[PDB]
């Protein structure tokens, strides 16, 4: 509680379900559930506690996803436990690692100063994001809410962690999913068209929007609504062809859309933007979902070559965070890419 100590029987987020007593203190409300910050008594480490109503007749979707995951670029589920409310009401409590900053907050610092994030950080943040996406996608899990607000950031170590799996779902080919998902600025165009048979490549579109935003200093597609979101995309990429539209949603064959020319892609970004950043962005923000890079292919992109330099260091004089501890799971979509991904000095 506030300055009381609360002791609960909680299950560790990894391994078998053997609950044990866990104590925490210093609860403070941060913000469809409720989110608290707390301190674990045994270690003093700060945690976030997400508390949501949970019906006993089914298992929490977010919890079942979180328990599968163990990756340095994904927020850790330390524990989970259940608590009470209204007659027979039960809350699920997800005890997550607490990280003080996000990419949203850090990038907003540079915007208000009218400045741009130095590209070394763009490389570091996007690389770790793509690693987290390769990892979750290897399980069939789509995050469905990739945006700067869901990218935890430790500014001292430059470690990035993907968080807020409340929208995430295991996508199964042949089973429909909801189309009004993802935050609007980062929503893939096939979702805007109302596709229900989409794939994990919607996360790659969202990541491309994040990369563009970090390069630009503001969201690249600031739509006023679902339809205006697509208009904003079209103002940059031009009208999708009839073919690209069919690849996004095959239900628009009786319609011919006005032809808008694409903006010159280099003129979208500031003059000195690295060409490899622009090239990577163009391979993420593709209308045709199957044309987008996979997360693992994105990690191998030339834009991240600086991160594989043996002499690379953070601007604060510290070593780079873990970048090359790839697992078989993470590499499973294209294992030979490890020849690029793991440099000789990292073996």
């Amino acid at each position: 509680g506030g300055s009381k100590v609360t002791t609960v029987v909680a299950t560790p987020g990894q391994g078998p379900d053997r609950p044990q007593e866990v104590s925490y203190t210093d609860t403070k409300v941060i913000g469809f559930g409720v989110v608290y910050q707390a301190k674990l008594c045994d270690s003093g480490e700060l945690v976030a506690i997400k508390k949501v109503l949970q019906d006993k007749r089914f298992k929490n979707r977010e919890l079942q996803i979180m328990r599968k995951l163990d990756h340095c670029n994904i927020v850790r589920l330390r524990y989970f436990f259940y608590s009470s409310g209204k007659k027979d009401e039960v809350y699920l409590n997800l005890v997550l690692d607490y990280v003080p900053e996000t990419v949203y907050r850090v990038a907003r610092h540079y915007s208000r100063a009218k400045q741009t994030l130095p590209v070394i950080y763009v490389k570091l943040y996007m690389y770790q994001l793509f690693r987290s996406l390769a990892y979750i996608h290897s399980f069939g899990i789509c995050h469905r809410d990739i945006k700067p607000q869901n990218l935890l950031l430790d500014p001292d170590t430059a470690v990035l962690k993907l968080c807020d799996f409340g929208s995430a779902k295991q996508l199964v080919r042949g089973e429909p999913n909801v189309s009004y998902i993802c935050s609007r600025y980062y929503r893939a165009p096939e979702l805007i068209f109302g596709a229900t048979d989409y794939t994990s490549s919607i996360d790659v579109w969202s990541a491309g929007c994040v990369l563009a935003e970090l390069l630009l200093g503001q969201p690249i597609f600031p739509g006023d609504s679902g339809v205006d979101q697509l208009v904003e995309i079209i103002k940059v990429l031009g009208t999708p062809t009839r073919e690209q539209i069919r690849e996004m949603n095959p239900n628009y064959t009786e319609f011919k859309f006005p032809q808008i020319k694409a903006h010159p892609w280099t003129k979208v970004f500031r003059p000195r933007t690295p060409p490899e950043a622009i090239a990577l962005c163009s391979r993420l923000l593709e209308y045709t979902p199957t044309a987008r890079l996979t997360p693992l292919e994105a990690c191998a992109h030339s834009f991240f070559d600086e991160l594989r330099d043996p002499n690379v260091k953070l601007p604060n004089g510290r070593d780079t965070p873990a970048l090359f501890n790839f697992t078989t799971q993470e590499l499973s979509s294209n294992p030979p890419l490890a020849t690029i991904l793991i440099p000789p000095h990292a073996r």
Partner: peptide, 17 residues
Amino acid sequence: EPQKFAEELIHRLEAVQ
């Protein structure tokens, strides 16, 4: 349902053409 969305999109694109 596509018919409603497409008609809206066509008008918004004509306003920028």
